[PDB]
Motif scaffolding. Structure first.
Motif, PDB file in Angstrom:
ATOM      1  N   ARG A  35      -1.389  40.698 -39.761  1.00 55.16           N
ATOM      2  CA  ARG A  35      -0.940  41.090 -41.060  1.00 55.16           C
ATOM      3  C   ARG A  35       0.527  40.772 -41.369  1.00 55.16           C
ATOM      4  N   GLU A  38       0.487  36.937 -42.120  1.00 55.50           N
ATOM      5  CA  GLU A  38      -0.051  36.737 -43.461  1.00 55.50           C
ATOM      6  C   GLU A  38       0.935  36.797 -44.557  1.00 55.50           C
ATOM      7  N   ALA A  39       1.837  37.843 -44.518  1.00 62.02           N
ATOM      8  CA  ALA A  39       2.998  38.080 -45.363  1.00 62.02           C
ATOM      9  C   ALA A  39       4.068  37.026 -45.195  1.00 62.02           C
ATOM     10  N   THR A  42       2.469  33.935 -46.926  1.00 56.99           N
ATOM     11  CA  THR A  42       2.575  34.247 -48.301  1.00 56.99           C
ATOM     12  C   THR A  42       4.046  34.144 -48.920  1.00 56.99           C
ATOM     13  N   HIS A  43       5.061  34.675 -48.204  1.00 56.32           N
ATOM     14  CA  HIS A  43       6.480  34.480 -48.485  1.00 56.32           C
ATOM     15  C   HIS A  43       7.022  33.005 -48.448  1.00 56.32           C
ATOM     16  N   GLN A  45       5.022  30.298 -48.848  1.00 61.05           N
ATOM     17  CA  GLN A  45       4.196  29.563 -49.823  1.00 61.05           C
ATOM     18  C   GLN A  45       4.826  29.755 -51.161  1.00 61.05           C
ATOM     19  N   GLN A  46       5.314  30.947 -51.514  1.00 61.31           N
ATOM     20  CA  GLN A  46       6.069  31.194 -52.712  1.00 61.31           C
ATOM     21  C   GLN A  46       7.300  30.292 -52.905  1.00 61.31           C
ATOM     22  N   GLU A  49       5.713  26.655 -53.311  1.00 63.63           N
ATOM     23  CA  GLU A  49       4.997  26.469 -54.519  1.00 63.63           C
ATOM     24  C   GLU A  49       6.022  25.980 -55.537  1.00 63.63           C
TER      25      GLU A  49
ATOM     26  N   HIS B  48       6.377  27.367 -44.171  1.00 67.94           N
ATOM     27  CA  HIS B  48       5.101  27.175 -44.821  1.00 67.94           C
ATOM     28  C   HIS B  48       4.247  26.134 -44.051  1.00 67.94           C
ATOM     29  N   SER B  52       1.163  27.912 -42.660  1.00 68.30           N
ATOM     30  CA  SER B  52      -0.184  27.489 -43.124  1.00 68.30           C
ATOM     31  C   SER B  52      -1.165  27.056 -42.036  1.00 68.30           C
ATOM     32  N   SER B  55      -2.020  30.454 -40.698  1.00 67.40           N
ATOM     33  CA  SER B  55      -2.931  31.093 -41.689  1.00 67.40           C
ATOM     34  C   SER B  55      -4.437  30.773 -41.499  1.00 67.40           C
TER      35      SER B  55
END
Lengths: 55, 55
Positions: A35, A38-39, A42-43, A45-46, A49, B48, B52, B55
């Motif tokens: 978990r 995952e964060a 997610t952090h 990827q932001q 992106e 990332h 990833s 992930s």
């Protein structure tokens, strides 16, 4: 007769809750590193992106 | 005559630095920000990349 019966009663519970924590201990720390990252994914990827627009 | 003449040259030397300063102020402060944002973006890209696969 009280002591021997209720001590037998008690040795089963104690056997049960020990058997429970053996299984539980791996699963929660593995879930916790899972978990956590995952964060992280997610952090990161932001910030990826928007890497294209920012470039 | 030599005092007035010297005031003028010294006024041209202030006038020239005041153009130099205006661009110096611009490009150091514009660059400082532009380096920060790019390198910030980069730690997230590198993150990332791994995170990833993880992930």
């Amino acid at each position: 007769r009280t002591a021997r019966a209720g001590y037998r009663g008690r040795a089963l519970d104690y056997a049960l809750q020990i058997n429970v924590i053996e299984d539980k201990r791996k699963f929660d720390i593995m879930e916790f590193v899972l978990r956590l990252v995952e964060a992280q994914a997610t952090h990161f990827q932001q910030g990826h992106e928007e890497l294209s627009r920012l470039s």
